[PDB]
Design a protein around this ligand. Structure first.
Ligand code: HEM
Length: 137
């Protein structure tokens, strides 16, 4: 289930983080605007850069922490507060996060692994809920 999916993702964090990030950017190329150092590069070019892996790994690790602390796929308000206060997400609306988890679920379902895609859907929705309640437009 959801908790084993955290263990599975964390088992190959750097790998999963990139392939999911790429799935997200390729599904929503309009989101790539937010990542100006990644514009104009293919999936392989990005993977070959050390900063791409470094950054995705950092993000995805925090995403797993938030998931691991979530109750029944409901993230802590104080974990949602952090993501809203982040000086990097300054812009960004709950739309962006919503889009992400669509790509995340779609990835898991296409993966072939026994991900509990439903729980990650439910987690993405409950986070998008917590983000607004934490002051995200
Ligand atoms: C759980 C979901 C998310 C987590 C945990 C998360 C986490 C983080 C973290 C930790 C950073 C800091 C990067 C660094 O210092 O290297 C960051 C930066 C950033 N995040 Fe997120 N993020 C999430 C969702 C999103 C979404 C949906 C977007 C929008 C598409 C986004 C866009 C960014 C951007 C633009 C930065 C700036 C990083 C940079 O330019 O170096 N994030 N994120």
């Amino acid at each position: 289930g959801f908790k084993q999916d955290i263990a599975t993702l964390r088992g190959d964090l750097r790998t999963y983080a990139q392939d999911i990030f790429l799935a997200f950017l390729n599904k929503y190329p309009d989101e790539k605007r937010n990542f100006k150092n990644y514009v104009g590069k293919s999936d392989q070019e990005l993977k070959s850069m050390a900063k791409f892996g470094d950054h995705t790994e950092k993000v995805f690790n925090l995403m797993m922490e938030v998931a691991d602390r979530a109750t029944d796929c409901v993230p802590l308000a104080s974990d949602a507060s952090t993501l809203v206060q982040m000086k990097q997400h300054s812009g960004l609306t709950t739309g962006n996060f919503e889009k992400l988890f669509v790509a995340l679920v779609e990835y898991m379902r296409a993966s072939g692994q026994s991900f509990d895609s439903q729980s990650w859907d439910r987690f993405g929705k409950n986070l998008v809920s917590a983000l607004s309640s934490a002051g995200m437009k």
